[PDB]
């Protein structure tokens, strides 16, 4: 069934699973035309496909050329997402294929189900949480590779850096979700927290700064505050 708070540790068991988020697949800027009408201009996007146990991120970059001459783009975007996820699964060795794919938006269920008919033993599941995976384009290195792309491209990352050397998947995913919630809630303040100290660097092969265990506790506390204040301050409290 649906993935929710009640079955949260299931994410970190030994059944291979993927989250798929399609929020950033079809991205536009809205602008005025010379005649005073409104038009969209598409910009590059990405599918965010994440193994929550290992941190492996399959980032399929969606180049704007895939929209050329097409209609009903927001609908096509869901089917394109399902096509690419299905292609990714077929490219993996059998023993690496997922047993479940969890979609962050219910509108992805039928497109993925149809594209995965060849895989009757892969469960396609919705989630009840409002997971903040849309903020992935607030991660600077991810945003950079998406916007620079000149053609369709898959880029692989570990979204946990080296954290799993010191913490469990359960803790790593919780830290990721907290950082993404911070980035979603107030991007500027969140990014100030993460880079304020010039002595804490981001290794070339990492996405996040090299915080010590102690520094992560401080950082995570600061993200909770920013998110607590804003949840208070947004419900004006």
């Amino acid at each position: 069934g649906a993935m929710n708070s009640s079955n949260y540790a299931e994410l970190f068991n030994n059944d291979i699973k993927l989250f798929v988020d399609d929020t950033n697949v079809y991205r536009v800027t809205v602008h005025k035309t010379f005649e005073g009408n409104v038009a969209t201009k598409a910009i590059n996007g990405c599918i965010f496909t994440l193994n929550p146990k290992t941190g492996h991120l399959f980032l399929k970059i969606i180049h704007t050329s895939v929209w050329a001459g097409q209609k009903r783009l927001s609908q096509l975007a869901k089917w394109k997402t399902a096509e690419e996820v299905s292609a990714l699964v077929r490219s993996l060795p059998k023993e690496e294929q997922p047993k479940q794919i969890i979609v962050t938006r219910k509108a992805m269920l039928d497109p993925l189900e149809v594209h995965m008919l060849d895989f009757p033993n892969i469960a396609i599941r919705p989630t009840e949480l409002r997971l903040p995976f849309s903020a992935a384009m607030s991660i600077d290195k991810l945003s950079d590779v998406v916007m620079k792309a000149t053609e369709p491209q898959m880029v692989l990352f570990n979204i946990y850096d080296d954290w799993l050397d010191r913490i469990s998947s359960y803790t790593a995913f919780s830290r990721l979700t907290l950082l993404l919630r911070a980035l979603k809630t107030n991007e500027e303040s969140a990014k100030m927290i993460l880079l304020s100290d010039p002595t804490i660097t981001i290794k070339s092969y990492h996405l996040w700064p090299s915080f010590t265990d102690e520094q992560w506790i401080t950082i995570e506390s600061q993200m909770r505050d920013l998110i607590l204040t804003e949840y208070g301050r947004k419900y004006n409290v």
Binding site: W79, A82, P111, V114, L117, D118
Partner: protein, 300 residues
């Protein structure tokens, strides 16, 4: 005009013949139904007074043999049987008619309702959906499940309707996932019409038979099948114009005949609102949309 005699009526029962019905009291001198119009299939159906559970009945065509009803006190139901001795049958019927112990099929002359509900329904096709080849007539009841229902448990007692499944490899060509899911014309015209049913008449016949079993027996799997066959046409952008016009007539008469007090269980809100207001054919079912809006505006 043919006759279905009854040996007797030992238990109190509501007997239906097509869209008509009448009450027979325990041990009342009822000996059958006469003046049944030749040229159509018919259904004779039963609801016992004690146990309104289990409506059941028989589909038959008097051109295919001489049929009668006889109550079985062991199995507790009225059974259809074939009489092979033709002179014995004529002699029985003639005597029951002389003693005026039969009800008359009560068709009004202007009234085309039964033809309109059974236009494409043929005994030969009923007998492939309801498999029991030693009989020329077919038993159906409220509880019987469909083959597709059994895939999701006695195979001999099943309704073998054509399986329709919109998220199936049969429905979806590799490489046309989005196209075929959003526009089911491929599945309708190539897979089902050209491949399985061979023509639109057999498709309509199964659709009409499914509706009639839903209405007369409350058969839930039949109702699912009727709505699936409607939805498959409405969700196809490319349907022959003659099929759309005929479908509108078919559904019009089904909706016209449906008891108003059964509409809540027998009509699926999602399918009908999709078909009439969102689908490719939202503007192709004028008669059906007008009777639905005037008779069941709540559903919509």
């Amino acid at each position: 005009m043919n006759t279905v005699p009854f040996t007797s009526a030992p238990i109190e029962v509501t007997i239906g013949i097509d869209q008509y019905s009448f009450n027979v009291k325990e041990n009342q001198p009822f000996h059958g139904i006469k003046d049944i119009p030749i040229g159509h299939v018919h259904v004779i159906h039963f609801q016992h007074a004690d146990n309104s559970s289990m409506r059941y009945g028989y589909w038959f065509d008097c051109r295919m043999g001489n049929f009668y009803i006889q109550y079985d006190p062991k199995d507790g139901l009225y059974k259809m049987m074939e009489e092979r001795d033709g002179a014995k049958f004529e002699n029985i019927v003639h005597n029951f008619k002389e003693r005026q112990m039969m009800v008359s099929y009560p068709k009004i002359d202007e009234d085309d309702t039964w033809y309109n509900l059974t236009e494409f329904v043929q005994m030969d096709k009923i007998r492939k959906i309801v498999r029991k080849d030693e009989n020329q007539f077919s038993y159906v009841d409220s509880s019987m499940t469909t083959v597709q229902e059994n895939e999701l448990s006695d195979p001999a007692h099943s309704l073998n309707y054509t399986v329709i499944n919109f998220k199936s490899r049969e429905a979806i060509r590799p490489g046309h996932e989005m196209e075929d899911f959003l526009d089911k014309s491929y599945y309708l015209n190539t897979v089902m019409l050209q491949g399985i049913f061979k023509n639109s008449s057999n498709y309509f016949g199964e659709l009409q038979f499914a509706f009639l079993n839903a209405m007369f027996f409350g058969n839930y799997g039949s109702s699912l099948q009727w709505h699936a066959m409607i939805e498959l046409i409405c969700s196809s952008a490319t349907v022959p114009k003659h099929m759309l016009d005929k479908l509108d007539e078919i559904l019009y008469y089904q909706i016209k005949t449906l008891p108003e007090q059964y509409s809540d269980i027998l009509l699926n809100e999602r399918v009908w609102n999709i078909c009439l207001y969102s689908s490719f054919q939202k503007n192709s079912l004028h008669n059906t949309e007008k009777i639905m809006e005037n008779k069941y505006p709540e559903l919509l």
